[PDB]
Every structure is written in C-alpha cells, then in structure tokens.
Design a protein around this ligand. Sequence first.
Ligand SMILES: CC(=O)N1CC[C@H](Nc2nc(Nc3ccc(N4CCN(C)CC4)cc3)c3ncn(C(C)C)c3n2)C1
Length: 307
Amino acid sequence: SGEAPNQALLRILKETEFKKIKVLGSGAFGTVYKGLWIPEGEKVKIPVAIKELATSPKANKEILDEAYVMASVDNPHVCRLLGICLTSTVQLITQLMPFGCLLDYVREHKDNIGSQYLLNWCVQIAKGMNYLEDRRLVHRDLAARNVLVKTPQHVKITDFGLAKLLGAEEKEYHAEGGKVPIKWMALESILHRIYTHQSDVWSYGVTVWELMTFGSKPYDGIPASEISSILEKGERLPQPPICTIDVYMIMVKCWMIDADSRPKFRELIIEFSKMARDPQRYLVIQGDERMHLPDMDDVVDADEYLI
Ligand SMILES: CC(=O)N1CC[C@H](Nc2nc(Nc3ccc(N4CCN(C)CC4)cc3)c3ncn(C(C)C)c3n2)C1
C-alpha cells in the first residue's frame, strides 16, 4: 500500500453522558468547558474538557480535522481525543488537564518553580514532539500556551488545529495564507511557508525560552511584520537570566538558519535528560534548593534513548 491505513477509532459519545460543570476558557474560536463523563452502566466518572465553537459549516469541517488528528495520537505526552459529541455544533471531548496551560502556570507560580521542574518539562515536551515526528506529524503551533499541565510533574502537548500529516516520501508542508503565529515560526516558514519537523524544533526553542523566562513574550513590543527582518540580520531571543550557556546554546541551535543543523527532538530528549540529572548545574535559580509545587556525566537511561 502507498501509505499505512489509519485504523484509529473515532468514538461518538451521547450528550447525556456528559455534564458541563463550568466554563474553563473562552474567547475567539469557541469556549472550553470542564465536565464529567460517565460512560453508560460503567461505574466510572472521568474528568473531561469539552471544546466547542454558533454553527457554521466552515467551523465543523475544521474541528473534525482536529479530531481526526487527535484521534490518531497515543502517547503519555500528547493529549488525545476521548470522543466527539454530534450536537448541532460538534464538541471535542478530551481528558481534563486540571492545572491549565503551562504558560499561565509558570507565570502564576514563577517564584516556586525549581530547575528540576523546568528541565523535566523540556524533556517531556521533547518526547511528545519526537512522538509526533514518529507519526510523521508536523504540529506547526508548538508554544508554551499549547502545552497543558496534568500535574506539575506531567505535561502534554495540545492544539492540533494546524497539524499536518506527511507522506512517506513527502518532507515539507507547503502552506497558504491564514494567521500563523510568527514569533514561534522558523525562518523558512515565514519566508516560504515551508514547515517540517525541524521547524517545529525552532518553535520548541522559543517554547523553552518562554519557560526559562517564566512566561515572557518573545520580542515583546515588536510588531510581527518586523520579525522576519530581525531574524534575517542574525538576531535571536536573549539568554534568560537563569540559563547557563549550556542551556542557552541549545536554544540557539534550535534557531540555526540551516534547518538540518538544528537538533532532532530525540537529541533534545537526551541532552535535557542529562541536565535533569544535575539540575542546579544548568539552571541558576535564587532559592532553588527549597522549592515545592503540588564519571557518569554521559549516562542516559534507555527509556530516554530513542532511535
Ligand atoms: C490559552 C487558552 O486560551 N487556554 C488554555 C486553557 C484553556 N484550554 C484548556 N484548558 C484545560 N483545562 C484547564 C484550564 C484552566 C484552568 N485553570 C482555571 C483557573 N485558573 C486560576 C488557573 C487555570 C484549569 C484547567 C484543558 N484540559 C484539557 N484541555 C484539552 C482541550 C486539551 C484543555 N484546554 C484555554
């Protein structure tokens, strides 16, 4: 066969199995709800988020593309769809990520986040992305806002509203118009609308910068139309205060002009894993030693060695 059959199950869930309990988020697109899912006859209550959007035939087409992608992934560091409800406007049903997105989380808990948590998040995000790359999937909107927190110890990548699947012999995605976030975009993406796993790596680099600065805005103040010019001249995001040159050098590499010179996600996993073994040698954080939220230099556990 040209390509491999996608045999994922799309699950359809009766409206009467859910119970919206509270708006969680709203704006633009639609709103996201917190709820409970109680499958029929089972004795189980599953905390869920329910994501919708008035009915426009343009919207439903796009939310179903998103369900398609979310239903095709299965990994501890990715959010998968639990199912869809076919109400007048189609709802996506996902597992509830109780602590919200990671951007707001690091802003809110700035003063209580130790280096161990920061480096572990980098390892986990890299594992999710490496998985998405295994599934031949280019995310195209990786950012701190699109990483969610199941616990402070455990995060997952979300938001496949722009994700694209690539043939077994296709190696780029050539996009069109439509608002993409320029400040997380690789250079090739901004000049040529080309996207690859390697341009996800660039976006990974920006996301890591967001975390290290406890939630700063990339090129704060700068109008998007300028970014391509800044980047072309050779400018990048500044080294975060807590960052050793070891860590910042990794961010810089994710931002090479030559996309094949950037690190692979499976390398990002290895490098950050090693740093996670001695956190304080790589991030310098005032008060690090006592923080709480609810030669073997080269040793890597096999679980983190992925080839
Ligand atoms: C950037 C943006 O527009 N967002 C990010 C969050 C939301 N999308 C979302 N949220 C989920 N859960 C959640 C959300 C906020 C909290 N609190 C509420 C109380 N605040 C003091 C602190 C945070 C708690 C939980 C969520 N769970 C699963 N998903 C799916 C769609 C992956 C979620 N999406 C919309």
